[PDB]
Amino acid sequence: HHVDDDDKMIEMIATTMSVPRQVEVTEKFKSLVTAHNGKDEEMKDVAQDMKNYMDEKYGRVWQCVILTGSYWMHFSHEPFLSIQFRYGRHICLAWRTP
Amino acid sequence: HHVDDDDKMIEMIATTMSVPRQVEVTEKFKSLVTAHNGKDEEMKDVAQDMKNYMDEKYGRVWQCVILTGSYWMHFSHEPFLSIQFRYGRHICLAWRTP
Numbered sequence: 001h002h003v004d005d006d007d008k009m010i011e012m013i014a015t016t017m018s019v020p021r022q023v024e025v026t027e028k029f030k031s032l033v034t035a036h037n038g039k040d041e042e043m044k045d046v047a048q049d050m051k052n053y054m055d056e057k058y059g060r061v062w063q064c065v066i067l068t069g070s071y072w073m074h075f076s077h078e079p080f081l082s083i084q085f086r087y088g089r090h091i092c093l094a095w096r097t098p
Numbered sequence: 099h100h101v102d103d104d105d106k107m108i109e110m111i112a113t114t115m116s117v118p119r120q121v122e123v124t125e126k127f128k129s130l131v132t133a134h135n136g137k138d139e140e141m142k143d144v145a146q147d148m149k150n151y152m153d154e155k156y157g158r159v160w161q162c163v164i165l166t167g168s169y170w171m172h173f174s175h176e177p178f179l180s181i182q183f184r185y186g187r188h189i190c191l192a193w194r195t196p
Contacts, residue, residue, distance in 0.1 A: 048172045061173075061196075064172055066170045066171070069167015069168065071163060072164045073162070074142065074148075075159075097161070
């Protein structure tokens with residue numbers, strides 16, 4: 001019912017990934033953001049480590065965008081692996097391109 | 099000095115594109131957003147037409163993200179064509195991947 005910035009939850013927005021990958025990707029984001037104390041000038045580094053973790057673990061090439069606010073996007077009409085989720089104030093968009 | 103939502107200006111954030119392409123890409127964004135009256139539920143379509151215009155005019159594959167708010171991103175340490183700019187409340191991120 002009621003959290004704060006310590007025990008806040010991951011909220012899925014949209015994904016085409018398998019359940020087990022959704023869990024890995026979101027737990028990784030959780031630990032990366034927490035390590036850096038959630039600082040905003042640290043988010044470029046979080047975006048970088050997300051992209052590297054996923055390149056290594058699911059093959060290349062991933063894009064990662066972190067934001068606060070609203071967004072509208074387009075990459076492909078084709079199927080591709082993507083995930084969009086919220087962790088507190090940050091929204092992570094990650095997806096893979098051929 | 100002073101504008102409104104009709105004669106608002108394009109504000110460059112970051113780019114690796116040539117001057118003449120910056121001009122083409124930003125004028126295109128201007129006309130696409132203006133046609134759709136700047137509506138927010140229209141922005142997915144604007145993101146789509148941006149991506150298609152650039153695929154056709156500069157070769158594939160482009161990604162386009164439109165947002166309001168703050169953002170931190172990562173695709174590559176390598177050189178790639180990208181552009182980030184603001185038009186009023188909307189921020190356009192567009193870049194090309196091999």
